[PDB]
Scaffold this active site. Structure first.
Site, short mmCIF file in Angstrom:
data_model
loop_
_atom_site.label_atom_id
_atom_site.label_comp_id
_atom_site.label_asym_id
_atom_site.label_seq_id
_atom_site.Cartn_x
_atom_site.Cartn_y
_atom_site.Cartn_z
N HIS A 9 0.82 -1.21 0.00
CA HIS A 9 0.00 0.00 0.00
C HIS A 9 0.84 1.24 0.00
CE1 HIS A 9 1.15 0.45 4.14
NE2 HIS A 9 0.36 -0.50 4.60
N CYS A 44 4.31 -4.12 6.76
CA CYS A 44 3.81 -4.08 5.40
C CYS A 44 4.95 -3.87 4.41
CB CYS A 44 2.76 -2.97 5.24
SG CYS A 44 1.34 -3.06 6.38
#
Length: 346
Positions: free
Chosen positions: A280, A290
């Site tokens: 993202h 992430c």
């Protein structure tokens, strides 16, 4: 004057026999007559729905072509003529099995859905299962082209038992998949019985692989067209084990243009595990858990991602595991996958 012995009366044979109970609804149903032919035969349920059946050519055997309900009493009616011309009645009844519970099931893919080359087929039951082995032997997978794969049971969840199907390698792009589960009238275990027959058709979309080497601070997206995206990125830095991008083949599932998640607000996020790992956008300059991209890059990637796309993650101390939650299928050896089948392997 002209004396002799009277010849044959018809002889009805019912399979299943009159007044039988706990009849399995997919058993073969029939009535056979000898020394005579059928004038009429028909079978109805308690509500008077006629069940579709068929004669044999000789017209001495009648057979049911559709399967029956559960917990339903069926009755026979009709006549068969003997060599006399004497018609004799065909009359009888039986009641099908009435299970303790009907256990259901449901694929996580839709018919006609197009997915990435690492898509598993997931069937999720609404109950635990005693004979996982028996539910499996009902399953069939057909691919075009044909591809080697295998069923395997995971830890029962709070909904119940579950089973995944995985090809040993990636699907060739464009592969059609046709899976069939014949669960109606199937004894799952104890008095529990399968809810209904299931089937699923779907296709594999274009080959797209993500290459995600944690030490490279780079991520690549590779297709038939070649490397179509090479982005700088920030991986999870292995300083705390809550914050290491897990190691191994991940599978894309969900994605959000805008989402709000109060962890254990994202933009152009793509889920690559139920542990909460995403690809993202976020304000950075290369660390976390992430895989961070610029807003612009995350948007480009996002629009091309597809349920079932594999994400290859390499060079990381912590392997993707059951603990990370679905999808952890590709992060185990084929032999260990095969081992998870409820039937023994070839």
């Amino acid at each position: 004057l002209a004396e002799k012995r009277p010849p044959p009366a018809p002889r009805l044979t019912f399979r299943p026999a009159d007044s039988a109970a706990d009849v399995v609804p997919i058993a073969p149903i029939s009535v056979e007559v000898g020394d005579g032919w059928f004038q009429r035969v028909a079978l109805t349920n308690s509500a008077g729905k006629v069940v579709a059946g068929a004669y044999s050519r000789d017209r001495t055997i009648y057979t049911i072509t559709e399967p029956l309900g559960y917990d339903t009493t069926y009755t026979w009616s009709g006549s068969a003529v003997g060599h006399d011309g004497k018609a004799v009645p065909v009359a009888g009844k039986f009641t099908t099995v009435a299970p303790v519970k009907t256990i259901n099931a449901g694929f996580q893919l839709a018919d006609g859905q197009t997915v990435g080359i690492a898509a598993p087929v997931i069937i999720q039951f609404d109950s635990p299962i005693s004979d996982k082995a028996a539910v499996e032997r009902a399953l069939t997978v057909t691919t075009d082209p044909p591809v080697e794969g295998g069923w395997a049971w995971l830890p029962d969840e709070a909904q119940g038992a579950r089973v995944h199907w995985r090809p040993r390698e990636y699907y060739p792009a464009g592969t059609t998949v046709d899976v069939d589960a014949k669960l109606y009238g199937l004894p799952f275990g104890d008095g529990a019985y399968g809810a209904q027959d299931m089937s699923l058709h779907f296709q594999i979309g274009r080959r797209q692989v993500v290459k995600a080497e944690v030490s490279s601070h780079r991520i690549q997206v590779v297709t038939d067209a070649g490397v179509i995206m090479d982005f700088p990125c920030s991986y999870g830095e292995a300083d705390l084990a809550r914050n290491v991008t897990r190691n191994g083949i991940h599978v894309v599932t969900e994605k959000y243009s805008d989402f709000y998640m109060s962890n254990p607000h994202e933009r152009w996020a793509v889920r690559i595990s139920n542990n909460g790992e995403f690809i993202h956008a976020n304000p950075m300059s290369a660390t976390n858990g992430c895989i961070n991209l610029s807003t612009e890059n995350a948007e480009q990637y996002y629009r091309s991602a597809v349920y079932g796309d594999p994400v290859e993650v390499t060079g990381s101390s912590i392997q993707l595991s059951y603990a990370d939650g679905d999808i952890w299928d590709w992060a185990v050896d084929w032999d260990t996958w095969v081992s998870m089948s409820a039937l023994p392997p070839p």
